Amino acid sequence: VIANAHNELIHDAVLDYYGKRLATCSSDKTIKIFEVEGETHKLIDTLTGHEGPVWRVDWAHPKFGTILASCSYDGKVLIWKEENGRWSQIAVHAVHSASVNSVQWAPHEYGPLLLVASSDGKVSVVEFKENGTTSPIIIDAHAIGVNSASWAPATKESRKFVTGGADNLVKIWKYNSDAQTYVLESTLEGHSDWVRDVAWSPTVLLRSYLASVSQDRTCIIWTQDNEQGPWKKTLLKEEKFPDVLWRASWSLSGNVLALSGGDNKVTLWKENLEGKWEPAGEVHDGPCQDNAKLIMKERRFTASYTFAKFSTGSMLLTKDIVGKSGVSIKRLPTE
The per-residue b/e assignment along 18-43, b for 16 or more CB within 10 angstroms, e otherwise, is ebebbbbbbbebebbbbebeeeebee
* DSSP output for 9-50: -EEEEEE-SSSSEEEEEETTS-EEEEEEETTEEEEEEEE---
**Which of 46, 2, 38, 47 is CA-nearest to residue 20?**
38
Distance, CA of 165 to CA of 155 (rounded, Å): 26
Helix (H, G, I), strand (E, B) or coil at 78: strand
- DSSP H/E element including 59: strand 54-59
Beta bridge partners of 114: 105, 126
- Backbone phi, psi, residue 143, to 5°: -40, -45
The SS3 assignment for 295 reads helix
What residues are paired with 162 via a beta bridge?
150, 172
Distance CA 36, CA 157 (A): 37
Within 10 A of 233 (CB to CB), how many other CB atoms are there?
14
50: phi then psi, degrees, rounded to nearest 5: -75, 140
In degrees, to the nearest 5, what angle opens at C-alpha 65 toward C-alphas 258 and 12? Answer: 30
Alpha helix stretches (DSSP H) within 163-313: 292-298
Q: What is the resolution of this structure in A?
A: 2.6
Q: How far apart are CA 243 and CA 260, in angstroms?
A: 10
Annotated domain spans of the chain: 1-335
Using DSSP, how many helices (H) and how many strands (E) does the chain show?
A: 1, 29
- Strand, helix or coil for residue 153: coil
Work out the burial of residue 80: count CB atoms within 10 Å of its CB; fewer than 13 is exposed, 13-18 middle, 19 or more buried: buried
Residue of 9, 35, 95 whose CA lies nearest to 329 = 35
Domain 1-335 has CATH 2.130.10.10: yes
State the Cα–Cα distance between residues 39 and 169, nearest whole angstrom: 39
Q: How far is the C-alpha of 328 from the C-alpha of 324, rounded, in Å?
A: 9
C-alpha pair distances (Å), 258 with each of 104, 234, 246: 18, 16, 11
DSSP 108: G
- Work out the number of other CB atoms within 10 angstroms of the CB of residue 264: 12
- What Å distances lie between residue 142 and 100, 117, 122, 146, 197, CA to CA? 13, 10, 6, 5, 14
- Taking the C-alpha atoms of residue 323 and residue 249, their distance in angstroms, rounded to an integer, is 22
Nearest to 55 by CA among 96, 21, 19, 20: 96
Query: Contact 322/308 with Cβ under 8 angstroms?
Result: no
Percentages helix, strand, coil for the chain, rounded to the nearest 5?
A: 5, 55, 45
Query: Using an 8 Å Cβ cutoff, are 83 and 40 in contact?
Result: no
